[PDB]
């Protein structure tokens, strides 16, 4: 468990925050939000919870991600979770969080394949995290089922747009492997909001369920559909493994064995897997935080130059100075 790529950046944020708080001002540390776009049952929730490093989201066959859960990670001194609709309660166990999320979804949408545009706001405080926004959006579908209205397709798409047309957002586009990449909706959306690939990261899931004799070797090499940041393959837990309470360590070991043994992927083994995605996102955040330094320097330099002309005289103030008095008199 855990995510150790945060540890090397947290003290940088703290030091910058302290440097600005010294003057009664904040730091414009506008880190990008992370939005996970995907088709229904593409695996977009298991990827997200593998980036956080905690097993707390509901996942599984069927329509589970019924509401647009928004997770806020706030750096703190201890570890706890809270909900805006459960104000005053404290959650010390992620299993309770998962069960409460399910109960809150059912309470509003019912037991059919319902949806609700209103998000759930879950905030987790921990000394090991950064101030991040994570958005788990409901998967897109083509036809209504259950008691959904005829426009279910358009309501879901509209829920996505308000979160991915915003600047400073990473579109983490998840598509299954045992399907044809040309028919992945997540990539159609990315091309509608990021016409040139600067933020979009491709992730290919379900590589272990490919039809025997076929592989995706020409997809992972960024040949079929060029994407500025390529595609990162991952292997998540299967439905049997979720129901079997499979450990996370075993899943990572199985993923590593899969890539090391597969005849068509050995040469890419060091470019794929869960920990590689963690490094890519952490590197993306680090590149962002460094890119803003010229603005902070220019603001501070301008303020310093503005005050210096008067500081030069204030620093020379003395309780007894007949020349200072005379200068003021003449002026």
């Amino acid at each position: 468990m855990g995510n150790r790529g945060m540890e090397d950046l947290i003290p940088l944020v703290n030091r910058l925050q302290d440097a600005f708080s010294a003057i009664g001002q904040n730091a414009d540390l506008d880190l990008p939000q992370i939005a996970v776009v995907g088709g229904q049952s593409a695996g977009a929730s298991s990827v997200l919870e593998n980036f956080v490093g905690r097993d707390f989201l509901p996942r599984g066959s069927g329509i589970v991600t019924r509401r647009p859960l928004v997770l806020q990670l706030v750096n703190a001194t201890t570890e706890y979770a809270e909900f805006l609709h459960c104000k005053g309660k404290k959650f010390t166990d992620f299993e309770e969080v998962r069960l409460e999320i399910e109960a809150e979804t059912d309470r509003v949408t019912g037991t059919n394949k319902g949806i609700s545009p209103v998000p759930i706001n879950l905030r987790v405080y921990s000394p090991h995290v950064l101030n991040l926004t994570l958005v788990d959006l409901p998967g897109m579908t083509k036809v209504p089922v259950g008691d959904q209205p005829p426009d279910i397709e358009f309501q879901i798409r509209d829920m996505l747009m308000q979160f991915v047309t915003k600047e400073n957002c990473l579109i983490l586009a998840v598509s299954p492997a045992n399907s044809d990449l040309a028919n992945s909706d997540a990539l159609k959306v990315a091309k509608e909001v990021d016409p040139q690939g600067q933020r979009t990261i491709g992730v290919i899931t379900k590589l272990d369920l490919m039809d025997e004799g076929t592989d995706a070797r020409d997809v992972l090499e960024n040949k079929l559909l060029p994407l500025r940041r390529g595609y990162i393959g991952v292997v998540n837990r299967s439905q049997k493994d979720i129901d079997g309470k499979k450990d996370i360590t075993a899943a990572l070991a199985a993923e590593r064995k899969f890539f090391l043994s597969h005849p068509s992927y050995r040469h890419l083994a060091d470019r794929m897997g869960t920990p590689y995605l963690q490094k890519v996102l952490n590197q993306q955040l680090t590149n962002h935080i460094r890119d803003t330094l010229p603005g902070l320097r220019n603001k501070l330099q301008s303020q310093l130059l503005s005050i210096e002309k008067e500081v030069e005289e204030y620093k020379n103030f003395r309780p007894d100075d007949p020349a200072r008095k005379t200068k003021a008199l003449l002026q």
Binding site: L12, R15, L16, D18, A19, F20, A22, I23, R290, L293, L296, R297, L300, Q301, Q303, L304, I307, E308, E310, V311, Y314, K315, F317
Partner: peptide, 27 residues
Amino acid sequence: QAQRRDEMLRMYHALKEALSIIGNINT
């Protein structure tokens, strides 16, 4: 006037400290 002087000097030193920290953070 005394209060304005004191605030200007405090802000001056704090801004100098902020630059001395940011430059070291960038490395």
